[PDB]
Ligand binder design. Structure first.
Ligand SMILES: Nc1ncnc2c1ncn2[C@@H]1O[C@H](COP(=O)(O)OP(=O)(O)NP(=O)(O)O)[C@@H](O)[C@H]1O
Ligand SMILES: [Mg+2]
Length: 314
């Protein structure tokens, strides 16, 4: 009786008639204890451990690039979360491009985690539903859902997918571009938590030098902590490659769209969902390159889960 948005960054569970009852980082901490590995923390508590664990301890993200990588740890993650909210029927989101291998792994791990039955829903369909798009109508709707692992672009109509594609670019690749930028341009080593803070605070899809923030890491030359100031322009330059990928995926989708649906999209524009939809200026950038209106869904982190939930209610 539940819907699971199983994401690289965040897992949400919608329960029938209750709405979203769990919203937690997709993180599992394991603790070494006599050669054996026990689950130590899952969720919010484990996320705060990333880049900060002592020797006996490991913080893991078992979902990468939109799909299950480490199946044993993902199963423990799903079990933990399903237990926390309580045999149910489950529907789970999956990237539209997920291969047959990747889909069977979600299915098996949910079955292994407790599910009686499992249905898979394509992420951009869920995202569109949850962002309030009229996906059941004979009209073209286009959604772009930018997560931590993948960016999903789709055109939907009549309760189905007209076009869809998953590209392996999103928030994680953005963080990695920022880490690489700090190393190459400032000879400073920063971690994933600092990179994500940069991205959220001054990260943007188009150069303005603009605002700035101070971050800390390890100075590579001196081997001591050092504080560096980074500007919106530098963050813009670091993010230019992944942002350009997302934009090209949108253009590719538009070229594949049947002309009457293209006509519909010209009116309605494009809807952005997912945590990556909050990247400053991403809406304007897509607008510039396509000619179309671009709207950011309200609370885009939760569109997929609300979409899966509405399916549960019908
Ligand atoms: N304000 C922000 N600006 C830029 N990026 C953001 C912002 N807020 C969150 N993010 C990113 O959004 C991502 C999380 O979004 P989310 O939609 O939950 O992805 P997901 O479902 O967990 N991953 P996926 O499996 O690829 O769909 C992370 O990479 C965040 O860093
Ligand atoms: Mg997602």
């Amino acid at each position: 009786d539940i819907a699971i948005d199983l994401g690289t960054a965040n897992t949400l569970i919608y329960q029938k008639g209750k709405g979203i009852v769990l919203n937690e980082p997709s993180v599992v901490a394991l603790r070494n204890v006599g050669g054996r590995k026990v689950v130590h923390a899952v969720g919010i508590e484990a996320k705060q451990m990333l880049g900060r664990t002592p020797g006996h301890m490991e913080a893991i993200r078992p979902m990468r690039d939109g799909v299950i990588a480490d199946f044993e740890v993902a199963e423990e993650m799903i079990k933990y979360f399903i237990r926390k909210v309580h045999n149910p029927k489950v529907i789970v989101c999956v990237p539209s491009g997920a291969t047959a291998v990747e889909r069977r792994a979600i299915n098996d791990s949910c079955l292994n985690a407790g599910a009686r039955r499992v249905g898979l829903i394509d992420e951009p369909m869920a995202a569109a539903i949850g962002a309030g798009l009229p996906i059941h109508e004979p009209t073209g709707s286009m959604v772009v859902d930018i997560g931590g692992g993948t960016t999903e672009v789709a055109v939907l109509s009549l309760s189905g997918i007209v076009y869809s594609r998953s590209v392996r670019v999103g928030g994680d690749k953005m963080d990695e571009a920022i880490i690489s930028y700090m190393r190459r341009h400032h000879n400073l080593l920063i971690g994933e938590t600092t990179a994500e803070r940069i991205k959220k605070e001054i990260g943007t899809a188009r150069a303005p030098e603009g605002l700035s923030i101070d971050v800390k890491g390890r100075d590579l030359m001196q081997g001591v902590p050092r504080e560096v100031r980074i500007s919106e322009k530098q963050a813009a330059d670091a993010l230019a490659e992944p942002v350009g990928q997302i934009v090209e995926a949108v253009k590719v989708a538009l070229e594949a769209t049947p002309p009457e649906l293209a006509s519909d999209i010209a009116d309605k524009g494009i809807m952005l969902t997912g945590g990556g939809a909050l990247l400053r200026g991403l809406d304007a950038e897509i607008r510039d390159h396509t000619g179309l209106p671009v709207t950011v869904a309200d609370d885009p982190l939760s569109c997929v889960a609300l979409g899966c939930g509405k399916v549960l209610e019908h």
